[PDB]
Design a binder for these strands. Structure first.
Ligand code: MG
Lengths: 32, 191, 53, 111, 291, 130
RNA sequence: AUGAGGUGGCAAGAAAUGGGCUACAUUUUCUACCCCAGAAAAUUUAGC
């Protein structure tokens, strides 16, 4: 039987926010 | 001032130094990489002031550690293929119609592309409820869109500006073709 | 976009003008670069011109 | 290096998808590059050590320039802000600048 | 010029950069090798430049800087080698050794080393006459009853380049479902490409694209070209051929089929007949093509 | 960061909708570039990401194209291709993967994504009109 | 008046040589086929 999953959705910047949450601050650099 | 690669440890978190796509920074990349055709009794040029290394689309922001760390955080966004569809044998059984559409990624100010409106519907006639006369009429109506070898009817729509409109038009064309294949005019009798 | 033949109601129904405007609308219904408004504006210009002549 | 080394030893200063087979707007990108180069050579007079590198990803526009350490850093920041804002409002795209200072011209050979 | 402290510093910089690259690529720094360095640098800094040298490179400093500056005396100034003052201590040391071996023996598909390679190994420039003298001594050593040690010593100076044999690699024999033996081969002439299957036993039937050869090739010249391989080895009417040719024109297709059939037939003839076919031009791809 | 670390991170809001998800039988990603090394690096990145997301990927190399022209002085334009065919991925997986790899598309490289969605027959065509 | 107009004319002739374009066939031409058919009728340019 074909159980089609549900279409989960996210905000436009959601992927960028996840990728950003993946990385920490650079301790040896001056601010961006 | 001294480059900050002197302060970078041998066990640092490299992805935090290059989070996103960035140009080559010889003061940030702690590698003694050289590039350039050497002169006679010369060496390839050093990185500081090297325009050739600056011209490379470097992948310092995508290292295997960084890629794995990215793809572990992105798993939250994914859904699962219905396991009942194990192969194309069942993908062509439970879902007879196939809709092909294309997106184009160039570089510039305008994202528009005239070729993205095209839609291609593919359906096997054996998967439609057609009798002998209905199938004969449908084949004669469509013409070259029907390929005898594959038993596939391929309707390509690009008339409308948008892509949803071309998809709706392809569906409408299929509907009307089926209905006019199942219909026998008075005139048909003279074959 | 694809059925623009309702805008030919005020034209002649069976003369050569019907033929010409059927050709025009068949061309316009195959136009992916125009909006519906521009197509109907073309049809209305044709109406005006043929009304004058 | 001479022009017959452009894919053998040198590279391309500008990098964009326009000239690939099937892509469009190569002319517009070329004119954009021309204006960027003249504008930048007129806005950083005697600072640029070498040619610009013009990179393009999506609608982004990165100018990687190599300048000298002869002009004051405050003026460098003022000009970076000015040029970024002006070029973003002129091309209606997010332009960005990545100055790299060098103590002096990086001479390769003597011709 | 490159001082020794300068290269020392480049050595620590290379080692630290190697450890950093191992960190970046996730590999274990202890076992991270130079091939790994090359692969990682190729990934991180992709470059399509045709010149391999122009591409980005991260080598050991010793591989970059030549530094062919060997010290030949210590702090007291005494030279290390007893032939130092000749100026050719390595070359004359080698000549002394060879003469010693010649004296000892007197009491009891490969090539001589080229001059510049001998220079590379001796790390000293030498003239043509002294090279000839050394080679003459080596020949004299070979003429005498050289033992295992002397044979190895001369082999240090003997390179294996000379001679190359043109033997015409044969295709293997395959067997079809019916149990018949056949061999397949390919040929090309201009833009025509052909693949022929030659059976061991037959009655001389050639089928081109499923069509008889005399129907597929109306022109007698093409039929003579197809006849040439089998006639040359006197086995007309003894093999069946099933070929497929595409592209080109009439003569190009005939020539490609001729080549494919000859190469497939080489399986069922003796090596002498293979060499005769080669010397007749029947096994060489014709490279002549339009500008 | 050795001690100063973010105590918590705000994960983006991904909501599980009620609508059914789109299904893609195939998803062909053709990338074009002037540089073979850049395409090899992008292929490595894309394939590793596909493995880490569980997507099934195959890679092949379409033949190159060369456009030569003259103003004598002869100029050339090379176009090299890499094709990444993904199989049996849903709508959300395809969107997230495509966003990732398109945002990380290198300069000078263009993309053409062909998506082959699977659809059922419309209700209005199942049986003839009586 | 090197500006703007009007009224008439103007529309050449002969060679020797330099060059260019067209058609120029029987090993040809038309039809069927793509090759076993039937009807019609002196310097100069390259060489490899
Ligand atoms: Mg006149």
């Amino acid at each position: 039987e074909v159980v089609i999953p549900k279409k989960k959705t996210w905000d436009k910047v959601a992927v960028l926010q996840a990728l950003a949450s993946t990385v920490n601050r650079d301790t040896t650099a001056v601010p961006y | 001032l001294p480059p900050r690669t002197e302060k970078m440890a041998v066990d640092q978190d490299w992805p935090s130094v290059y989070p996103v796509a960035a140009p080559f920074k010889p003061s940030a990349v702690p590698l003694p990489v050289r590039m350039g055709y050497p002169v006679k009794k010369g060496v390839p040029m050093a990185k500081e002031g090297n325009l050739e290394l600056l011209k490379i689309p470097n992948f310092l922001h995508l290292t295997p550690v960084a890629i794995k760390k990215h793809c572990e955080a992105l798993k939250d966004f994914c859904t699962e293929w219905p396991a009942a569809l194990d192969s194309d044998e069942k993908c062509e059984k439970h879902f007879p119609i196939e809709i092909d559409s294309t997106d184009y990624v160039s570089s510039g100010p305008s994202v528009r592309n005239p070729r993205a409106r095209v839609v291609v519907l593919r359906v096997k006639l054996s998967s439609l409820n057609l009798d002998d006369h209905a199938k004969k009429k449908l084949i004669k109506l469509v013409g070259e869109r029907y390929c005898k070898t594959t038993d596939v009817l391929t309707i390509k729509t690009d008339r409308c500006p948008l892509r949803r409109q071309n998809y709706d038009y392809a569906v409408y064309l299929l509907t009307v073709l089926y209905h006019e294949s199942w219909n026998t005019e008075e005139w048909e009798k003279s074959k | 976009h694809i059925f623009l033949e309702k805008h030919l109601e005020s034209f002649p129904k069976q003369g050569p003008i019907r033929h010409f405007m059927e050709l025009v609308t068949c061309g316009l219904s195959k136009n992916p670069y125009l909006s519906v408004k521009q197509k109907v504006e073309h049809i209305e210009w044709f109406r005006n011109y043929f009304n004058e002549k | 290096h001479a022009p017959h080394y452009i894919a053998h030893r040198k590279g391309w200063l500008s990098l964009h998808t326009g000239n690939l087979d099937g892509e469009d707007h190569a002319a517009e990108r070329t004119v954009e590059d021309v204006f960027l180069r003249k504008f930048m050579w007129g806005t950083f007079p005697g600072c640029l050590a070498d040619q610009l590198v013009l990179k393009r990803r999506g609608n982004q526009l990165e100018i990687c320039a190599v300048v000298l350490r002869q002009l004051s850093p405050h003026k460098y920041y003022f000009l970076v802000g000015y040029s970024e804002t002006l070029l973003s409002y002129f091309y209606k795209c997010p332009v960005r600048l990545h100055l790299q200072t060098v103590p002096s011209k990086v001479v390769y050979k003597y011709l | 010029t490159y001082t020794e402290d300068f290269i020392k510093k480049q050595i620590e910089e290379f080692n630290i950069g190697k450890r950093h690259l191992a960190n970046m690529m996730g590999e274990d720094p202890e076992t991270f090798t130079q091939e790994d360095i090359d692969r990682a640098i190729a990934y991180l800094f992709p470059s399509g430049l045709f010149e391999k040298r122009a591409r980005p490179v991260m080598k050991h400093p010793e591989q970059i800087f030549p530094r062919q500056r060997a010290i030949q005396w210590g702090e007291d100034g005494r030279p290390f080698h007893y032939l130092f003052y000749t100026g050719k201590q390595s070359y004359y040391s080698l000549m002394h050794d060879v003469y010693g071996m010649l004296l000892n023996l007197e009491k009891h598909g490969s090539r001589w080393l080229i001059k510049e390679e001998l220079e590379e190994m001796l790390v000293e420039k030498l003239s043509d006459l002294d090279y000839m003298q050394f080679i003459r001594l080596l020949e004299k050593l070979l003429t005498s009853q050289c033992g295992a040690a002397e044979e190895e010593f001369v082999q240090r100076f003997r390179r294996s380049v000379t001679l190359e044999s043109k033997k015409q690699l044969i295709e293997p024999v395959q067997y079809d479902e019916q149990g018949m033996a056949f061999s397949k081969s390919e040929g090309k002439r201009k833009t025509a490409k052909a693949e022929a299957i030659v059976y061991k036993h037959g009655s001389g039937r050639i089928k081109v694209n499923g069509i008889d050869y005399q129907l597929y090739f109306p022109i007698t010249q093409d039929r003579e070209q197809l006849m040439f391989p089998f006639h040359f080895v006197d086995r007309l009417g003894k093999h069946d051929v099933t070929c497929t040719v595409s592209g080109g024109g009439r003569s190009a297709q005939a020539g490609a089929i001729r080549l494919a059939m000859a190469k497939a037939l080489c399986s069922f003839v003796t090596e002498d007949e293979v060499e005769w076919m080669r010397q007749a031009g029947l096994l060489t791809t014709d490279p002549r093509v339009r500008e | 960061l050795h001690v100063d670390v973010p105590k918590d991170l705000t994960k983006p809001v991904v909501t599980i909708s009620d609508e059914p998800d789109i299904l893609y039988k195939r998803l062909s990603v053709l990338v074009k570039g002037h540089d073979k090394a850049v395409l090899d690096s992008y292929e490595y990145f894309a394939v590793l990401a596909a493995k880490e997301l569980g997507i099934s990927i195959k890679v092949h190399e379409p033949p190159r194209k060369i456009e030569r022209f003259t103003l004598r002085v002869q100029y050339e334009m090379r176009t090299l291709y890499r094709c990444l065919e993904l199989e049996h991925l849903t709508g959300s997986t395809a969107d997230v993967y495509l966003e990732y790899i398109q945002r990380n598309l290198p300069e000078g490289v263009a993309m053409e994504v062909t998506k082959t969605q699977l659809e059922q027959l419309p209700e209005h065509i199942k049986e003839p009109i009586w």
